Every structure is written in structure tokens, then in C-alpha cells.
């Protein structure tokens, strides 16, 4: 089947990974072209103004086993934020796609796990530069070095996650959050979200020159 | 009336935005000036050790409709911390002001608003730049693609502030942690600040050769 | 006696600073001595993935009264995980030396005290680089500039520190938590070190550059 | 009109001949943007190519023409094989820039540079302000931005924008025998030092060292 | 005693000439300062101005004279328009760090250069360390700063720290004629392209790219 | 065989000649290495000490040899005091990125380099694709990189890879001549302003006016 079903529900699509005989695996070379045509066709509608990224099934995406780093370059091209619905299990790579979104809110049976370490591997795709931006270090240096998992209270508690909703809430949850920042003005949330990117490395001169430009 | 009215206090200057006719709007260039001018005298006073940034009424600052960086710039060159007591509203320009200050407190009835994308804007005035490193990234992106209000609590609850006071509390709480600064010699404390301010950039390597010697 | 003493229990190595003329200062030429050759001989031994750092009796390291820089530097280089287990007090160069550590847990009777301005001096040894990066830069500012004192749930709260425990359960617990890092594969242990120390500094493109050629 | 960008190999040399005759190699059309992306990728994945050598077909470089425009910049920072800028002639604009963006630049003595932008009221749209520094040094990258003023291929070597000078019938040749010396290396070592050399021009030192540590494998 | 800085205008080109003839043209003193900063906040005000000659009266450029030494370089980080020094005679210790400061240097045949600091037993105050490798390169930024001697203009002119050497009388000539090169063009974008140029000595390509996009309207 | 590294000191001025006669001077190995570490230490505590020489004993300067390797820069990253490369011979390899490494390089007519690793389908391990572009521009560092040819002491001079090339019986009187230009001012203050310089050429301007306001006491 299509391994990334695209909904689309005025100006928010959402994004659903189906890789059924492989817990939603993201390493699959049908997935990383699915996925980069649909980061250009959003970018391209520019009606669009929001992305909820969530898993089809039990799992958001147990990740799988350079190739592995198109889809976190996909995502740095995407010009619309990114919510990612974490229904469950986000393991490996899928933690790291997870964790490069904008927004994270999960379901009470998500859990994270970046495993890497416990199969002699490092984060191949960049989820040591987003995880201590979303937890910070020390407890990205807890997951990271540990491998272990981290459940959805644990996850809220941290700041992992912005919300944690009963299973069968979490969609709703999305789409409620979605719809607050749909309702702007599309290409002002674009603007935004281009103009918060440059701040995570930038000067506050460079972000300066760039809001003055902007506006 | 005076936009900018300005209380000394031992070795703490308080500072209350006071523009009745525009909500405590900072936009105005008689404002800028004042700041400007506050900045100034408050770096050339070695005595001074601390400022309370608040707003007169029942807003901090509904912020207003590059001049509109010249407050932001007047920040980045005040050697002396401020501490913002928020004690209402604090939108827009007057959100990032807020956000801008090296410690926030709110009352109970305040609330943030980083409402330019529900206006077709982005945060002109560098905004974007502090707020991630207020609430971290994803709550930023919440609040700038959003634009909605975030109460006291919530606030709190993320970061955004330190205490949260009754109405009456607040400037009682905002001196209270002043003099815990003011106790301290006056050129350390602007000599920490000035160190601090180094590590939100530098490198570790540019901070250890700034602190060997500034000791 | 020996400034600091280095038990081995597998993986796992324990430093304990024994300082006792001295409540476990660290500013003296032995100890400092002594935490160089530690570092070489635990990047030298290949089986160790973890250290936890500890004070002898009551204090962790009253700290003391560039040389100051070699402990912080000693550090830097160490390439395997190092979990501060804080028993008491840490003040001065003991608190930065906590706050330079991987990860932190705490004695319900342990404290912090970032205290230098009160002395007229700032963090000579690093201190203002990462202490913002373990409690965000809003409350290192209250640190710093007051000197004031962190009691363990304060620190808990902040994310200071990851857990608090009774003063009984502080070790058990470091080891605890040690052996969930050292039960993975030594060698990628401390890739995983090494790549989260980048993604501190470098960009997203150094980082994706790094973990592709490690990996 | 014509496939834009002409493909021809010789071993571990590619070369790449902007070729659009309707616009005087102008590199702003997305037809040749397409193609420029394509050969990138398709360079990368041939792990037999070690070099590639950019030219124009023609009188022209390419005189630039009329974010789109900085798909091309991107693809040279993804390009894993070096670059040579044979410039035969005009490059205008944003033809200027592409050169500049290249690893190593040589050129004809019909050759000539214009950051013409400012002329018509524009700025380099395509990131050659950062490129521009870097090959001739922040004076000469402010005389070229702020006058547009064209500079020939004498006061290109003068400045280092160029690293030699030859003859139109030369420089070819030339670009080959430079190729050769690029290319006779093992080809994975090519690819790792330029990934290397791209990291030096904005990493810290230790990025550096990290990076080195992790590659000589 | 006189008005530290004359400021005069000839259409877009404004010519800002030190004079402080009692402290052969130091730029050290608040009066100055205090002018420094007027005059780049009444350039960037007037958007009919796109080039600004900085020069000294009579012998000397800056003496240099003896954070307050710190609000030149800033003021000449905000300055939207380009700043052309034309080094007439000796620049100094500040007054050689004024000078490399500036985007485009050219000399009289009696200027010369000196970072004079540390043969006094101070360092540069105002930030020199940091433009000057980025005017000579590393190498020979640590040689002047090492040793503190004097460079005349032709090794300036060899060393890239100055685009050409004039004789006394062609010196104010030859800048204008430079500062008509930028004047001719529009002045927003004259503004644009500097403000641009700035953003690439230190940002990554990226930031770049995004300031170029946003800036072409 | 013999101590690796030999140290004379002449005042202010050190002499530091690698001597690994049975490797040609190879700095890769373990007691070299450990006496650059105690040389660096030494220099750095003896205030006494305001400038090092760094040559080689015989033919060579260093053939280089065959993390450990990146000890040897970020001692040069430590010393507090500027260091001359005094090119005699072959520098090659690790000797290549060592005298790159170096603050300021003068070389002997019999002098060359190579940035040879990746002829031996290696890639510079210790950081010389860091600092080779900043000594030669990233062009010039490209083609030395990627060809790994060897440059000759004329044409190292043309490309301000070194600042001056002597006859081989000139090169350590000119290093002593170029070293007591240094040495003749102030201990103190020549260790600040290299420290001043270490820290432009990655930091803010921003970061080094701070340093520079708290460096001056």
C-alpha cells in the first residue's frame, strides 16, 4: 500500500505513515520519496499552512534499519509547521522524525526511544542536534546514552511533548491545535516559521536584519 | 504625560511604561526616546544595580502598530539586569519586550500574546530570537504560529515567567528579587551579566577567555 | 590523603573528592592533578563508559578560593559519560563543577550556590556557559546574580538536577542510573558522547556531517 | 530549445556545458535550474566521477538572465565531486556568481565578471554575496556589489578570483589538465577532502578535527 | 577647538574630514565620538546619501590619540552606507584600526599604517584584531600586530590593505572618482547590497540566502 | 634516538628544531608528540618567553609521517606565544599542516610543500583543511587538497603561503631578525594581542570587543 496517505482538510493536511509489514518504518525507499513529494506538493500550496504527521496503526514508526538523511532534509525544507500526533511506539528513527518536528503532542500509549545506542549505532539523521533542543542536554544525554524508553507523563514532563490525550483524543487534539494556527493568515505562519528556524542558530543581528526585511 | 516614569530606590530603578491613551503601547517615539534615555543614565550610574520594567494600569503593554529595534538595541547595551513584572497584558511589541528583559514575574491577571501572525506580521523587532530561549522552541512556535494568549498559570507552567504574584504581590515580589541582586557589589554584578550575555553565543572557548580575563 | 579517590565496579568508575582540611575544595594543585590523570586513565581504558563524580561526607565541593580552567578543560576531554551524584553543598567552582558534569541527581540535602558575586568575582571557570544550558537562561541569571543558595527541590524543579533522593539512596541510585548506560556497547557509548557534544555548538550541517562518517 | 546543460565524460571527468542560445547561457530558467539539480545528483550517485568542469557553449559563460534562483547554490553545497569554472566569456549576474560559487575558478582572455546587480537596482538574489568575499576579499567583493562594474580576466587573476589566465583556445586544455591532477587521486579520498574543505569554511576547528577523526576511514 | 568632524557634500557623496589639529587627528577624544555618531545617524537618515569619504585634514589621517574607544566600531556597524578611507597621511593606532574599519581603502604615497599598541604595552581596544586579518589575512595581521611597525603604502598596497596608491594631490581626486562608482547606482539598493555584505562576513550561507530573498523587494 | 624536539633559547627568542633524523623529521610519532606538549607547557609558563622559532634539523623541515596526530594542533592552539615557522625543507603531510599552523611562515629557497594525503587515498587528519584556506585562500587550499601537488617555495611566496623566502643560509637570521621585531616589546602585552588574535578568527565582533575592553589591565 502507499506508505504515506495524504488527507487533506482545508488549509491542514494530515500526513499518516503506513508501512503495515514493518511497524511504519521510515527507512524504505518508497517512504523517503513519498515523503519528499509531499513536503514539495505542501510547500507548493501554498494554501496549506499546517502538516499533522501521525502513524497508522499501533505504532507512529518503530524508524527501521547520506539515504537516511533525506527525510530530516525533507523536513528542513518544509515550509509549513509540522505537528507530530505521536499515536505510539517512535523508536530509532522514528523518535528522530518525531523530535525534528515542530510540535509534538502523543497519545497516553506513545513512547520514545532513541535505541540507537543499545545496537552499537550513533542518531545516523541529525537527532542529536534536535534532541537536547527538545528536552534539553542532560536529558538527551539520558536517552541517548541509555537507549531506553520514555513514556508519554514522563515525555510531557520533560517537554518532550506539549500534550498527552487519551487514545482516542489525540487526533481531535491535533486537528484543535492545527486550526489555531490555520486560521491565520497563510503566508504570515510561513513567515514566522522561517523567521523562528534562523533564530535557532543565527545572531540576534542576523534575526534582526531578517524581521526588518521580512516586514 | 511622561512615557517613561522612573523611581530610584536605593540601588534599584523601577520603570513604569505609561502611555494611558494607547494601553502602555511602546511604539510611540516618545517612548523610544525615554528608553533610550533610561538606558543611558542608568549604565553611567554605577550605583544602580537592577531595574524593574513594569507597566502602569491594568497593562504591561499592549505593545503598538529599524524604529521599531531601537527599544530591543537600548536593551542589549543596559549593563545593569532588568526584571520585567508583568502586571497585565503584554501583546505584541510589548509581549517581546517582556520577553527581552532578563527575568520575567507576572501577576495573577497577566497574560502573553505573540499575536503578530493574526495581524499578516512576524515579530518585527527580534522577538523570535528570545522567545525560544524563554519556553524553548516548540512552545515558541506554539505562541508565534498561534498568536494566542497564554495566561499567568501556563506561563508559569512553561517557563515564560518565574513566580506568579496576586495583583497586589507583584511589585513587592519584583523588589524582593532586586535586592537579592542588589545586595551584591555593583561592578560584579554588571560584570556577570556581561558574562552571561557572552554565553548565549560564544563558543566555550570565547566564554573561559572572557572570564580569565575579566578576573 | 588522596584528593580523589577512583573505585572501579565494571564499567563504572567512582571519583569521590576527598578534601576533608578543605570541604572538598577543588581550587588545589593536587586534586587538580589528580582529575587530569583521572580523565586520561578513564579515556584510556576502553571498558569504562561511565563516571560518577561524588563528594566525601557532607559537601560535594565547597568549591575553593587559567588554573581554575584545568578541571573544566580535564572535562571537555573526558570522552565517557560523567553523572554528578551531588551528597551537600556545592558552591563556587564545586556548583560549575556539577553543572560541567553530563547529567545530575541530588541528596535531598544538597544545594547550589552559584556564588561568586557575592565574593565581587564572576565564574572564572566556565560557570556562566553552562549553567544556562542546564536551567535555561532566566533562572542561571538569578543565580549568578544574586549568589543565592538552590535547595534540591528547587534544583528538581529547574532540571537542575534529573532526581532527588534521600540521602541514603543517592549512590544506589547513580549507580542505577550508570548501569543503564553501560549495559550498551562501550565503543558507541561514547560516539554518542562525542556526537552530542557537537550538536551543542555546530550547526545542523555539521552535525548531519558527523553523524554520516561516524556512522 | 536545446537540452541546457550538455553532459560529456572522459573517465573521471564530466564536463557540463550551460548551453540556453535564446538567453545567452542564462542559468535563471527553470529548465537549466532542473538539469543543474539532476547533474548534481546524478554526479554524486557515479562514484567513477571525480571532477567536474563547468563551462559555456558559445561567446558566453552565462550572462546570468532575469527561492528559485538559489536552487543552483544549493546544489553546488550538495555537490560531493569538485567543481572547475572554465569561464570562456561573460558571466553576468547571476552567471557571475555560479562561478564563484564553483571550487577553483580559470578563465579565457575574453572572459570578464559583473555582479551587476546593484546597476538595475537589485541585490544578488542567489547568495553571491557570501561567495564573493571569500574568492577576492571583502574590499574587492564590496568595489565589484557596490559599483556592478565588470571586471576583465587581468584584474580577475590580479584578485585571485581566477587562478589562471589563458588563451581561448586554451583554456579548455587547461581545464582538463587541472581536472587530471584532481582526478588521477583515488576517488573516495577526492570526495571525503572536499566534504572536509566544505566544513572548514564555517566549522570551528574542533568541528573540524571531529570530522577528520571520523572520516579517515 | 574646531569642529571635530567637517562634514561637506557633493551630491550622494558626503566627506567626512577629521580635524582635530591640537591631537593630529585622534579619534579618542568624546568630542569626536560624539560627532562619529551624529554623522553616521545623519547619513543613514538621509537616504539621498549612498557614499561617505572618510579622510583626515593636513598631514595626518588619525594619529589614533589615547567602552568609549569602542562607539566608533559601532557606529560604523550600523553606517548603511558604504565608507570609502582615503588615507592621506599616517593612520595610528585607532586611527589605523578607523581605517581598516572602513569597506574600501586607498592611500596617499606618505600615508602609512601602524598597530602601534603593543610596542606601548596595550592591545587594540577598539576591535582592530578583528578586522584587520579580515583586511591582510592572519598572517600578516599578526605581523603588524606583533611588532607594531610601521607599514608604508606601497607594502600596504602589495598586502591588500589599501586598492590603490595615490600621490597627495590625486588622493581626494581619485576618491571620488571611486565614490561615483557606487553613486551612479540606486541608492536603495547601493544600501541593500552593503547591508547584505555585512550579513556574509559572519552569517552561514543559509542566513544569507534567506536576508537576500527577503531583501530583493 | 635522539630528543625529538631541541630547544635553544637567545633571550626572549626560543629555538624549537625537530630532530626525528631516522624518520625525516615525521612529527606523527608518540615522542615527538609528548615533547611539542611539554615544549608548548614550558613556553607558556615562562613569562620570560615572548616568541619561538619552530625549523627543522637537516634537509627537512618535516616529511610529516604516517586523536593522536591532533594533540600536536591544539597544542599550538594553547601556546600563548607566537610561533615562526622556519621552513628549511620538504614539508609534507603532517610537516605541511604544522608550518600552516604556525602563526607567520618564512621559508628557505629549497623549501616546498604538500598537502599529500590525499595521493595516498588519505584525507589531513590533524586540521589542515582547517587552517590551509586561511592561510592561501580556499581556492589555492582546493588545488593543493585535492591534487596533494607540491608547491615550491616561489610559488608558496606568490600565494602568501610564506611571507618571505631566503637562501637556505638566510632563513634562521631572517626568522632571528623577523622574531626580535617581536620580542622587543612588551612580554605581556604580545601575549594578549596573540590571544586577541586567536580569538577574531572565529569569534563576533561583538565577542572581541568584550575581550579586548576586559583584556586591556
Known amino acids: 500500500t502507499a506508505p504515506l496517505r495524504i488527507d487533506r482538510a482545508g488549509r491542514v493536511q494530515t500526513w499518516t505513515i503506513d508501512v503495515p509489514d514493518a511497524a511504519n518504518a521510515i527507512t524504505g525507499s518508497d517512504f523517503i520519496d513519498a515523503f519528499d513529494a509531499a513536503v514539495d506538493a505542501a510547500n507548493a500550496d501554498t494554501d496549506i499552512s499546517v502538516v499533522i504527521l ?23 525544507r518544509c515550509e509549513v509547521p509540522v505537528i507530530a500526533a505521536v499515536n505510539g511506539a ?34 545516523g539523521d541529525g537527532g542529536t542536534w534536535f534532541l537536547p533542543r527538545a528536552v534539553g542536554w542532560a536529558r538527551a544525554a539520558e536517552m541517548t546514552l541509555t537507549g ?55 545572531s540576534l543581528d542576523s534575526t534582526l536584519a531578517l524581521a526588518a526585511a521580512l516586514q
Open 54 to 76: 501521525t502513524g497508522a496503526g499501533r505504532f507512529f514508526s518503530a524508524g527501521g534499519n547520506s539515504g537516511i538523511q533525506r527525510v530530516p532534509r525533507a523536513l528542513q
Open 148 to 202: 531506553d524508553r520514555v513514556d508519554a507523563a514522563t515525555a510531557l514532563s520533560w517537554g518532550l511533548v506539549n500534550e498527552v490525550l487519551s487514545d482516542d483524543e489525540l487526533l481531535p487534539a491535533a486537528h484543535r491545535l492545527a486550526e489555531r494556527i490555520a486560521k491565520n493568515p497563510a503566508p504570515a505562519v510561513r513567515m514566522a516559521k522561517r523567521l523562528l528556524l534562523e533564530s535557532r542558530t543565527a
Open 90 to 123: 517512535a523508536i530509532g528513527a522514528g523518535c528522530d522524525l518525531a523530535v525534528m518536528c515542530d510540535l509534538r503532542i502523543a497519545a497516553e500509549s506513545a513512547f520514545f526511544a532513541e535505541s540507537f545506542v543499545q545496537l552499537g549505532l550513533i542518531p
